[PDB]
Each structure stands twice: as structure tokens, then as C-alpha cells.
Amino acid sequence: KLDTSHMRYLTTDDFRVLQAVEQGSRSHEVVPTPLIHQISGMRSQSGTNRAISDLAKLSLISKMRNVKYDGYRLTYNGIDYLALKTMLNRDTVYSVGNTIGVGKESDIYKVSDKNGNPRVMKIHRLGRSNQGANWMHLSRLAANKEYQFMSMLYSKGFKVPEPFDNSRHIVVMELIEGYPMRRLRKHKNIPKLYSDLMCFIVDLANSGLIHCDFNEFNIMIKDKLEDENDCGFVVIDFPQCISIQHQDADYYFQRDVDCIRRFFKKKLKYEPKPDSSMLDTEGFGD
Amino acid sequence: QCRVCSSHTGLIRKYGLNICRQCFREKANDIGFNKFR
Amino acid sequence: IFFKPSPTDAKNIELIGHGTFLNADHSRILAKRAILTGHPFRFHKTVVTVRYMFFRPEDVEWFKSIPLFTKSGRSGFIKESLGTHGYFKATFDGKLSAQDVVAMSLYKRMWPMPSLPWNG
RNA sequence: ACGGAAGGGCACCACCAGGAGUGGAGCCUGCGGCUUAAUUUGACGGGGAAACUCACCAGGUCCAGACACAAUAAGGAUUGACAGAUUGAGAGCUCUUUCUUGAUUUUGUGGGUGGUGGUGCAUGGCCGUUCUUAGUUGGUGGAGUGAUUUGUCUGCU
RNA sequence: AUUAUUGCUCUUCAACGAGGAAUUCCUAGUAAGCGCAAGUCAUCAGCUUGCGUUGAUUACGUCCCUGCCCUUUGUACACACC
Ligand SMILES: [Mg+2]
Ligand SMILES: [Zn+2]
């Protein structure tokens, strides 16, 4: 797994060589020793072999000596620290360390920047490791995807975490002082919050999306003030999203709505008076 | 501790034998415990 | 020619050293290094308790970020303060014994000094 | 070597058909995290558990040095039986006695005694793991200057 | 025994109206329901390992994914050209 600490053991040179193996494994399968010696743009065996010893000791690389075929294998940690080094260069992350959100294809940590403003890190682990090209590649494409979806969600006004950065399969996002529908006990204006959560699914099917899974743990609720009680309805849902043209968009949309109403019925004992928005009205709305 | 190898750990304190599991597995055949099933 | 005038010798000069006028450069900065020494007290399979490098816990707080290097050629960092006596827990690159020395490197700016002509 | 060419097995740590569920709840318990003077620590540790186990904390105690060597010392260098002074949180700790004293020296120096000083080299060996050998090996023969090859195969099983 | 070891008496009666993405385990005296005994043990389980009691549904298929292999084959990229 992820041990961010170890990254502050590496120098300019160890990152240089690790980068060289990153350019050399995306060109050839198993990068041999001379490939790393010649591509790294280094001086001698001194710097490169010392660097590789560091990376191999700190589990960023694996030595594959296949019947005279000497080569190397970049582990997930290597990719992690290269994205993280790219972000250290792009002045986006400065410290890491507090795990809230252990997803299947996503790990969520708590990070910080130069200024001290708290943020969140969603790295993507497809298959967690028997590394081929597809695991790393599709994790990279996964976070690309989710960051682009996220950027289009922040751009169009939706209350969705502002995407700051997409370092490969890793994504830096805004920390949101919120609480999920489980941890929430009661609200001062439950009908307004329902109106909000329905108007949102309306505008989402107006954009062309149907976030198939709109449950209780999905919806975060950020509090801005304690005297006046200001709420904000954050929603984490992107790879489970289903476009408005798919054959099955109907019961997905109406499952979202039925879940909104069923939770608002149980936890806050507030049933909706206006009829729930069907798929058809939103099929014309887009 | 295990009255064989200076070990606080592994102790089978049962029946007053006090051998850690590692040494007791070795001395098992000399004590009387044999492999049947 | 570098020398120090000694009255006792025949030549009233002690010839110290020689060399050349190299550079008219200010860009050369000189950092006085300062090493702090500490003994690695106790050992756990990843965490080493280190002894006698501080004597207050707040002092240990003050130097948290600063890297720890061992003359055995190994890197590391501090974790947290153990006692009220400055003991501090630490993580490292390799496995270190009680024969190693954990050390800190701190640096200060050193400034060139004014010169006066010499006669007689 | 490698394949992400294809082909077979052959499997509830795979899928079908289900069965019971878990994930939602309270509580338990372990891991992380934070907090801490310490919240010992490994990655189940027989790791069950207020003293013990404690390996971690805040303080209070002892016991140091083999010896060598230089002064002191018997008209005193200082070791043992006690009682009160004690004495702080609990013990010691010191000095006035009745007393043993009686060289165990007290003090200061040095290379190392002490290695009930731990780290490393060589050597013998015991416990833990693997190719967890579950298709290999070599021997003659043939072919090739040679790396190598045939055996170790079309078939069918 | 304070930060309550545990047991007993009265009282307080919180959450929790079959549970989202997902995922574990299982083919006959087996799953599941149920307790008991023994290890830890001075006090205790909700810990573990056995035991007996009650005792189903569904396969007896397949390589769909998960792996594990074993073949066949092209080949080191025998580090081919850009
Ligand atoms: Mg032959
Ligand atoms: Zn033993």
C-alpha cells in the first residue's frame, strides 16, 4: 500500500533515475539495466546504480533477471511517487496522511498544500499486485475520466468537490467539511433540502447524466455556519454514472428518486407532497 | 518461560510441562506424543 | 604567498602556505555546519528510540522536520518525543545498532572579513 | 526467458442454482489515526486480560574500577551488630551512641579487567522456509567444427 | 476493583421497520439454528478448538470471470526499423 513518508528520502537524482525507468517501461516492457544507464542522461554507474539501489530498497522497483535478460519493474509505489513528485513540482501537494475513504478502485487520503489549506487525494488502484500494462494504464485513464467529469461538474454549478489536479491515476480535490446521510441526525429545513436534492437530479438529467447510485452515504452535507446553519449538498458519483441514452436510464433515475424519498421518509419522517419527477420529463428536458 | 530455549513466548503452560510450542513440537516424540492422525 | 611574521627566526617570517589569486566572486557563500550527536538507545523492527541529543520535548518539536543521518551512511527522520527528558523515537533507512551515531546537520551563513595592508 | 497466439483441464479461497449472510444499527474486539508524561511493540503474535505478565511513563534508590600505580595509615585507612536522630510518596542516606573496628584501605592516574560487553569473520552444526522437488537426471550410443541435438515422438491414450 | 473485574436487585429503555456500492463461507448428518466442554483461567468472551442436539434449500454443470496449471505455437524486442 501507500507509505508516503519514504518519498522524502529521495534526492534529485533518485527521482531522475525513477523518471528514466518511467520513460523506459512505457516504451519497452521490462527496462534493462543499460536502458536505464543510457536514457537517464546521467554521468556514470555511480549515480544510476546508487539511485536504483535506493528505489529497490524502498520498493519502487523490482529486479527481473530472466535467463541473462536483466531488467527492472516499476511497482505501484513508483508511479505514486512520480505523480506525487510531479505535484511537488506543480506546487499542489506538500503533506499527506489521514485515510478516510477506502474504495475498491479508489483510495482517499487527507492532504495539504503550501498554504495550509486542507484537501483530499483520490488515487486509483485497479487490481490491488500483479502489475501488467492494463492495471496502471486503466487506473491512469480512470482518474483522467473522473477528473474530467469532476471539472465539468464544478464548471456547471453543481455542488460537487472542486477538482484541483489529476496527477495520473491520482487526483487532488477539495476537502469538504461535510457529513453523510448516515451521520446526520436532523435538519432545520428538510423540505428545502429535499427540494434541492430533487432539483439536482432534475438538472443532472438535464445535463445528460443519471448517477445510478444516489444513496445515503453518497451525499455529503457541508455546514458553513453554526449560528445560521448553512448546508451544501455534495455528491460523489462518476464511474457509476449512466448517460441519458443508455437502454436502462429509466429505472436508474427512478431508483435515485425512490431512494431520496425513502430516506427522507425514514430518517427525517418527511414525505414529498409533489409527485416525484419521472424519467420522461427529464428525457425531454435534455 | 520455556525451560529449553530462554523464551518467554510460545509457552505451553499446560500440565506443568512449560515448553514453548516450537521446542515442545520437537521434544514431542521423546515425551510420548506421536503422529497418528 | 601566505605567511605569519615571526620575529624569532632569522627570516622574520614564518612561511605558512602558497597558492594563487583565483576569483573575484561574491556568489561564493560559506555555510558553517553544526552537527548534533545522539546515541540510538533502543530497537524495534522499524522504530528506534534515540538518546542524548536533546533534553526537552519542545526542543525535539522544534527540530522535527530536520533529517537524521548516521555516519554508517543511513538516513531517517524523527517521529515523536518519548519522555520529559528529550528521548525521541525515530524511523530509518537501514537497521542500526548501538554502535552507530544519529546526527543532525544545521547550517549558518559565514561572512568574509575586512583586510588591512601590511608594512615593515 | 516472454506472450495479452491458440488448446485443454478443473478448482465453491472460481462461476451457476441457491442457503446463510456481512456491508446499514447498537455493543465487542483487533488494526490505523489522533491524544497522551507513557498510551511498549511487532506484522495473529498463545497478544487474553487492575499488581505480576511489561518490555512504556513521572519521580526516589543502590552497586560500580578487575587491577596496576602514587600518597595516607596501625599513635588510624576504613568494613561488620544495633538504638534513636531519620524520612520524602515508600526505602535507603548520613552522624551521635553502645559496639565490631583493624587495611576489605580512602583518594588520584593509566593500558584494559568486566567481557553476569554487546556487535562482525571463519568453522562445525541444529529449528524455519524452496525447485515447497511431483518429470527430471546422468550413463553409454547416433548427428553436428560448435552452441546444441536425438532419447524427451506422427499417432492414440 | 477509582477509569466502574464480574455476578445479583430495582430503574433508565438510545439506535435499529431486512439494510447502498460491494463481498465472505458452503454440496449430507453437510449449511444454518442451538448450547456445552476444554484452553487462556485468580474474575470474565462477544476469543479459540472440539462436541452433541435440531437439521434444509441447490448443483453433481461449466470454463463465463477468479486463479492454478499443462500443452501447442511463434519469437527475446536475440534489445528489428521509425
Ligand atoms: Mg553422447
Ligand atoms: Zn523453546
Side-chain angles (χ1 to χ4, degrees), chain A, chain B, chain C residues 1-70 72-77 83-88 90-120:
Chain A
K1 294 169 184 171
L2 179 58
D3 296 326
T4 296
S5 53
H6 297 171
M7 204 211 84
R8 56 183 177 162
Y9 288 77
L10 303 183
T11 334
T12 316
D13 326 310
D14 310 335
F15 285 115
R16 189 47 191 181
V17 167
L18 196 47
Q19 288 158 14
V21 194
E22 195 82 355
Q23 292 166 349
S25 192
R26 287 179 165 186
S27 54
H28 288 301
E29 308 188 359
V30 182
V31 222
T33 331
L35 257 202
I36 311 182
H37 294 352
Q38 300 180 3
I39 296 175
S40 45
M42 275 220 59
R43 300 298 184 187
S44 171
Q45 172 89 2
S46 59
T48 80
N49 175 35
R50 282 175 60 181
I52 294 182
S53 69
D54 289 335
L55 313 174
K57 282 179 182 185
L58 294 168
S59 306
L60 314 183
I61 230 168
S62 303
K63 299 206 170 184
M64 307 187 73
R65 306 173 185 177
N66 305 319
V67 190
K68 312 285 180 177
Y69 188 95
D70 199 303
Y72 289 89
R73 174 186 183 181
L74 290 151
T75 58
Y76 49 96
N77 294 324
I79 324 169
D80 292 335
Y81 290 135
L82 280 178
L84 288 162
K85 186 57 184 177
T86 323
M87 279 327 108
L88 187 60
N89 177 233
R90 296 187 204 171
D91 305 342
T92 307
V93 186
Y94 190 79
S95 74
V96 181
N98 176 246
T99 76
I100 303 184
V102 192
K104 304 208 68 183
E105 303 176 11
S106 58
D107 305 352
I108 309 174
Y109 308 92
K110 196 180 153 191
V111 309
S112 199
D113 319 325
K114 297 184 153 192
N115 308 312
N117 50 322
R119 297 190 179 179
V120 140
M121 196 176 64
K122 296 180 196 171
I123 91 181
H124 274 279
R125 291 189 183 174
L126 268 78
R128 59 173 181 169
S129 59
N130 311 322
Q131 298 154 13
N134 58 317
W135 306 111
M136 312 163 161
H137 240 266
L138 297 173
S139 71
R140 159 77 166 146
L141 299 170
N144 290 333
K145 179 183 178 182
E146 298 198 4
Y147 181 86
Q148 297 307 319
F149 282 52
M150 202 93 51
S151 294
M152 305 311 137
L153 282 153
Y154 173 86
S155 291
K156 302 166 194 176
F158 305 108
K159 298 175 188 184
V160 141
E162 176 193 357
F164 286 108
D165 138 71
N166 56 326
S167 36
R168 284 173 174 171
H169 73 292
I170 303 179
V171 174
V172 172
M173 324 225 36
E174 70 179 5
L175 190 85
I176 290 167
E177 297 178 4
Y179 318 102
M181 296 305 177
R182 212 210 103 262
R183 278 190 231 167
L184 295 163
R185 164 183 179 172
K186 57 185 177 180
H187 299 88
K188 63 157 193 176
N189 200 349
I190 307 162
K192 170 187 170 183
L193 310 208
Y194 172 87
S195 304
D196 286 21
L197 288 182
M198 284 275 91
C199 170
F200 266 152
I201 311 188
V202 168
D203 297 335
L204 284 170
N206 272 342
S207 183
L209 278 189
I210 295 192
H211 300 109
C212 157
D213 213 311
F214 212 109
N215 61 11
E216 301 77 19
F217 320 99
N218 192 325
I219 330 159
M220 212 71 51
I221 291 201
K222 45 165 186 170
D223 304 338
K224 293 215 173 188
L225 302 181
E226 302 179 12
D227 295 332
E228 303 177 345
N229 311 311
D230 291 328
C231 266
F233 313 97
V234 170
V235 167
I236 313 277
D237 201 345
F238 332 95
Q240 192 73 350
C241 91
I242 274 128
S243 186
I244 206 175
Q245 283 179 347
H246 289 273
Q247 307 178 17
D248 293 325
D250 189 36
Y251 62 82
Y252 282 150
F253 189 96
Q254 300 203 346
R255 269 166 196 181
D256 301 334
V257 182
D258 288 335
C259 294
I260 291 282
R261 295 159 62 207
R262 85 189 187 187
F263 167 81
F264 267 85
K265 172 184 181 180
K266 179 168 292 175
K267 178 71 191 195
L268 298 160
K269 294 173 183 181
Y270 165 68
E271 296 176 353
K273 276 184 177 170
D275 293 333
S276 56
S277 60
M278 306 281 89
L279 176 95
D280 317 328
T281 312
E282 314 291 337
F284 185 85
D286 182 33
Chain B
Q1 38 171 17
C2 156
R3 64 164 72 213
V4 185
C5 76
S6 323
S7 187
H8 293 268
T9 299
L11 256 180
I12 310 279
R13 223 152 62 110
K14 193 179 181 181
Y15 292 151
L17 60 95
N18 271 262
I19 319 281
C20 79
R21 47 184 197 94
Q22 285 104 347
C23 297
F24 172 72
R25 274 179 45 89
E26 304 171 11
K27 315 298 179 179
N29 200 280
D30 271 326
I31 289 177
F33 292 104
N34 300 86
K35 287 265 296 180
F36 275 136
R37 189 178 56 107
Chain C
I1 321 183
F2 299 84
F3 64 99
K4 164 181 165 187
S6 178
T8 311
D9 200 338
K11 46 168 183 177
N12 298 113
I13 282 179
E14 165 187 7
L15 285 178
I16 295 186
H18 62 281
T20 321
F21 185 105
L22 295 173
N23 279 335
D25 199 349
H26 55 285
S27 309
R28 195 173 185 95
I29 98 103
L30 280 79
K32 177 173 180 176
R33 198 217 281 126
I35 306 175
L36 305 190
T37 54
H39 318 278
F41 181 21
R42 268 166 182 182
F43 313 100
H44 308 267
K45 285 188 177 181
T46 316
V47 176
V48 167
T49 300
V50 194
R51 197 185 197 211
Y52 284 110
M53 195 166 87
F54 304 93
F55 296 100
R56 308 174 196 178
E58 309 81 19
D59 299 340
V60 180
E61 299 169 341
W62 218 81
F63 289 105
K64 271 221 174 185
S65 52
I66 290 88
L68 296 178
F69 71 107
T70 303
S72 300
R74 287 168 194 189
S75 171
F77 300 93
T84 326
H85 295 297
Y87 285 78
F88 76 100
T91 318
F92 285 94
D93 199 313
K95 308 171 182 180
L96 295 161
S97 64
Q99 282 285 41
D100 305 318
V101 182
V102 191
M104 268 183 176
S105 276
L106 313 180
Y107 309 83
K108 192 194 173 178
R109 188 63 187 275
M110 291 271 79
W111 295 99
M113 303 200 58
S115 181
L116 333 175
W118 182 92
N119 297 310

